[PDB]
Symmetry: C2
Subunit: 119 residues, 2 copies
C-alpha cells in the first residue's frame, strides 16, 4: 500500500493524529515519533497518559496526516490502533527512544486500512 | 483569550483540522486559509464538499491544531463550527480569496471554546 512518495513525506513531516473519545469528541495532536514499522503498520512512542492514548484504548479509531506545506503534498492514513506495554513492539520502542527521549510508557501500533491523497 | 505567540503560530503554521462524522469516525485534514476573525473566532474558505464540511454541518465538533515543529511550540483550539454561504463572513471570505484561490463555495466559522498548549 505505502509507496516511496509516501515514505518520503512520512520521514520529513510531522504526523498529526486524529482520534475520538467515547462521547464522540474528536482530538488532535502531533506525534513526533510516528514511523513506519512495515508497509501496512506505523508505531509511535507513547510517553503520556494523554487523550490520544485513552481514545485508542477506548475504540481504536485513528487517522494520521502528513502534509508538506511548501511542496503542497500530503497523505491521510486511516486505520485501527492499539496500545501495548510489553512485547516485541514495546521493546523496539524502548530501543528507538535511546539517546532521543525518555523510556516510553507504551507503544502505539496503527494498522493502516486506507490511504488518501491530501493535495 | 489569544496571545501574540498564539498569533505567530496561527500566522506561520498550517491549521490541521479534526472533525467527526455521524458514525463516530475521526477525520483530519489541512486548511491553509484558516485565520482569525476575532479573539474567539476563526474563519476558513471552504472550496469543497469534503468530509470536514460534511462533519461540521452534521454536528459542529471541531479541533484545530497549529504546531511549530522547530521551536517545539503549539496550540489546540477546541470549539463548535458552522458553514455559511451568504452574509458578512462569506463576503469577507470571497474577497480574501481574490489573488489567492478560487471563489469559495462557503465559509467555515469556528467558535473557539477552549485552548490547550501543546508545549
Amino acid at each position: 500500500m505505502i509507496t516511496q512518495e509516501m515514505k518520503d513525506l512520512i520521514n520529513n513531516q510531522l504526523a498529526m493524529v486524529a482520534t475520538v473519545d467515547a462521547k464522540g469528541q474528536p482530538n488532535i495532536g502531533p506525534k513526533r515519533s510516528m514511523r513506519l514499522w512495515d508497509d501496512k503498520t506505523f508505531i509511535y512512542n507513547e510517553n503520556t497518559d494523554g487523550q490520544t492514548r485513552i481514545n485508542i484504548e477506548d475504540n481504536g479509531k485513528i487517522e494520521i496526516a502528513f502534509v508538506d506545506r511548501e511542496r503542497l503534498l500530503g497523505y491521510r492514513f486511516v486505520g485501527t490502533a492499539e496500545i501495548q506495554t510489553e512485547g516485541a513492539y514495546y521493546e523496539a520502542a524502548k530501543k528507538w527512544a535511546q539517546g532521543r527521549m525518555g523510556v516510553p510508557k507504551a507503544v502505539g501500533i496503527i494498522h493502516v486500512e486506507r490511504i488518501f491523497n491530501l493535495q
